[PDB]
C-alpha cells in the first residue's frame, strides 16, 4: 500500500464534499478536487510524518502532490503548461505557509488511519501536542491507536510472522 | 497526377532544395478565372500544394 498523510482539515473536506478517496493517488484527479493550499499542506504533512513505514512489506509513504505536479510539468502533453502554472502556485503557497507556521517547531501530531483499498492508507494528521524533551518517545506514546490500526490492517494481507518483525509492531509494544 | 508523375522529386534533385514543391499554375480564360479566384488568402490546394 501507500500512506498518504493529510491534515484533518483536508480529510474532513474530502469526506464532507464527497471526493473519491480511491483516486487521490492519481495526480489528474486530486488536483481537480483539491485546492492549491490543501495540496501544499499535504506536502507539509508528509514531510512532518515522523514514522518509518515497513518498507520490507512494500508499505511506502506517498510522494507529495507537489512533486507529481512538478514532474508532469516537464512531460510533453496537452496539459503540461497548465500543470506548470499549478506548480508555481504550489511553491508560492508552500513558502507562504512555511514562513507562517515556522514557529510550530517543537510538537508532534496524532495520526488516524483511514484505509482506502489496498493501495492507499490515508493517515489523518489530527491535533498537535507540545513535545520538546524526547519528542520521539512522546510521539510513540501518543500514537498508540495509530500503530494498532496499521497493524490490524496489514495483518489482513501480510503474514503475522512478518508483521511482528516490523518497527510499527515494535512501536505498539513500546507504547503498551 | 502529382503522385504518379514523380514531379516533386524532379524539382528537388534539379534545384537542390529538399523542401521545395512545385507550384501549379491555373491557365484560364477571363470567364473561368473569375471562378477560380476565391478566398485568396488561402490560395492553397488539398494540403501542401500551392
Amino acid at each position: 500500500t501507500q500512506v498518504l498523510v493529510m491534515p484533518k482539515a483536508v480529510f474532513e473536506s474530502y469526506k464532507t464534499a464527497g471526493v473519491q478517496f480511491n483516486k487521490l493517488l492519481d495526480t489528474n484527479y486530486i488536483v481537480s478536487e483539491t485546492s492549491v493550499n490543501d495540496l501544499a499542506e499535504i506536502h507539509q504533512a508528509l514531510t512532518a510524518f515522523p514514522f518509518l513505514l515497513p518498507e520490507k512489506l512494500d508499505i511506502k509513504l506517498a510522494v507529495s502532490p507537489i512533486i507529481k505536479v512538478a514532474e508532469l510539468g516537464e512531460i510533453d502533453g496537452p496539459e503540461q503548461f497548465k500543470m506548470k502554472d499549478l506548480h508555481n502556485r504550489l511553491e508560492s503557497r508552500l513558502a507562504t505557509n512555511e514562513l507562517r507556521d515556522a514557529g510550530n517547531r517543537n510538537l508532534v501530531y496524532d495520526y488516524y488511519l483511514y484505509p482506502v483499498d489496498e493501495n492507499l492508507w490515508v493517515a489523518v494528521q489530527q491535533s498537535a501536542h507540545i513535545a520538546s524533551s524526547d519528542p520521539r518517545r512522546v510521539s510513540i506514546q501518543l500514537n498508540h491507536t495509530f500503530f494498532d490500526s496499521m497493524i490490524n490492517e496489514m495483518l489482513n494481507t501480510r503474514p503475522r510472522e512478518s508483521v511482528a518483525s516490523t518497527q510499527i509492531f515494535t512501536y505498539y509494544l513500546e507504547s503498551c | 497526377a502529382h503522385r504518379d508523375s514523380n514531379i516533386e522529386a524532379a524539382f528537388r534533385v534539379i534545384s537542390g532544395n529538399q523542401d521545395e514543391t512545385p507550384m501549379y499554375l491555373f491557365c484560364s480564360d477571363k470567364e473561368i478565372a473569375n471562378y477560380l479566384m476565391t478566398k485568396g488568402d488561402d490560395r492553397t490546394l488539398g494540403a501542401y500544394l500551392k
Partner: protein, 142 residues
C-alpha cells in the same frame, strides 16, 4: 422574523437556471455566514471552527424549513470560506484588500502581466521572496 424564514425569503431572489441552482444557493449561505459570525478571542482555530460549524448547521436546519439547501455541500463551502477568513487574520492579507478598503491605483494584475510576458517571477513569488529574505531580520529582533 425567524432567521430561517428571512434568509429563505432573500435566497428566493437569486436568478434560476436549473439544477445548478443548489450550488449557487449553498455558496451564498456559506459566504454570508462564514464571514459574518464573529470570532471569540479565547478560542484557537480548531475550536472556532467546531463552534462556527455547529451554528452554521443549525442555521441550515432552520433554512431547510423554508427553502431546500443541500446540507453537505453548504458545509463544504462554509469550511472553505471560513478557512480563508482565518488565514487572512493569521497569515498574509492580499493587497487587493488594502486597495479596496483604503491613491491606490496600479494593481497586482499590472505587474503579473509584465512578469508573465518576460516569464519571470510574479507578484506572489516576489512576496514569498520578500518574507523569506526578511525571515532572519524579524526573528532576530523583537
Amino acid at each position: 422574523q425567524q432567521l430561517g424564514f428571512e434568509l429563505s425569503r432573500i435566497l428566493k431572489q437569486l436568478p434560476n437556471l436549473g439544477g445548478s441552482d443548489r450550488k449557487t444557493r449553498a455558496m451564498l449561505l456559506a459566504n454570508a455566514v462564514a464571514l459574518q459570525i464573529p470570532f471569540e478571542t479565547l478560542l484557537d482555530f480548531d475550536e472556532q471552527q467546531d463552534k462556527a460549524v455547529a451554528k452554521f448547521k443549525k442555521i441550515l436546519s432552520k433554512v431547510n424549513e423554508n427553502i431546500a439547501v443541500d446540507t453537505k455541500l453548504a458545509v463544504t463551502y462554509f469550511n472553505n470560506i471560513l478557512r480563508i477568513r482565518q488565514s487572512l487574520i493569521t497569515g498574509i492579507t492580499d493587497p487587493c484588500l488594502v486597495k479596496a478598503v483604503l491613491n491606490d491605483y496600479l494593481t497586482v494584475d499590472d505587474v503579473n502581466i509584465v512578469s508573465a510576458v518576460v516569464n519571470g517571477p510574479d507578484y506572489n513569488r516576489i512576496q514569498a521572496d520578500m518574507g523569506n529574505a526578511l525571515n532572519q531580520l524579524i526573528g532576530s529582533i523583537d
